[PDB]
Design a protein around this ligand. Structure first.
Ligand SMILES: *[C@@H]1O[C@H](CO)[C@@H](O[C@@H]2O[C@H](CO)[C@@H](O[C@@H]3O[C@H](CO)[C@@H](O)[C@H](O)[C@@H]3O)[C@H](O)[C@H]2NC(C)=O)[C@H](O)[C@H]1NC(C)=O
Ligand SMILES: *[C@@H]1O[C@H](CO)[C@@H](O[C@@H]2O[C@H](CO)[C@@H](O)[C@H](O)[C@H]2NC(C)=O)[C@H](O)[C@H]1NC(C)=O
Lengths: 49, 49
């Protein structure tokens, strides 16, 4: 049985905003404000591919 | 002239209370307060992730 889902949760990040954390424990090492042209001023450490 | 003058001024010189700039004393820094716990929630959630 195959079921696809779309969960919409809330994630929180603290200053310096170098990682956020959804309510389900998805710790992501990406700055919530990294727009792809400001890597020098915002962290990004997850998989590049 | 050459005559002595009676010194009859009872001195009452009360030195004023000097100002004190109270420090904001810091006993345990934030690092120590975060390291005082055996179980760190962030590390546990990162391990689960
Ligand atoms: C991605 O986000 C970065 C910041 O993390 C953006 O860079 C910043 O973009 C703003 C908006 O254009 C720039 O402000 C502009 O500055 C000049 C004065 O120098 C003025 O002419 C404009 O009115 C405007 O306010 C800002 O300088 C720039 N850099 C920094 C370091 O904040 C970037 O634009 C974002 N990219 C995208 C594609 O959204
Ligand atoms: C990338 O960011 C770093 C710090 O996040 C910037 O380094 C600063 O550069 C300014 C201007 O040269 C210095 O006054 C600061 O002392 C530097 N800070 C640090 C922590 O090194 C760097 O300039 C940024 N690169 C850009 C915007 O191209």
């Amino acid at each position: 049985n195959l079921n696809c889902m779309v969960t919409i949760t809330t994630a929180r990040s603290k200053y310096p905003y170098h990682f956020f954390a959804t309510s389900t424990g998805d710790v992501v090492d990406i700055s919530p404000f990294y727009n792809g042209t400001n890597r020098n001023a915002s962290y990004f450490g997850e998989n590049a591919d | 002239s050459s005559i002595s003058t009676v010194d009859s001024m009872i001195a009452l010189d009360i030195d004023p209370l000097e100002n004190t700039d109270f420090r904001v004393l810091e006993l345990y820094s934030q690092k120590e307060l975060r390291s005082s716990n055996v179980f760190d929630l962030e590390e546990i959630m990162r391990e689960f992730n």
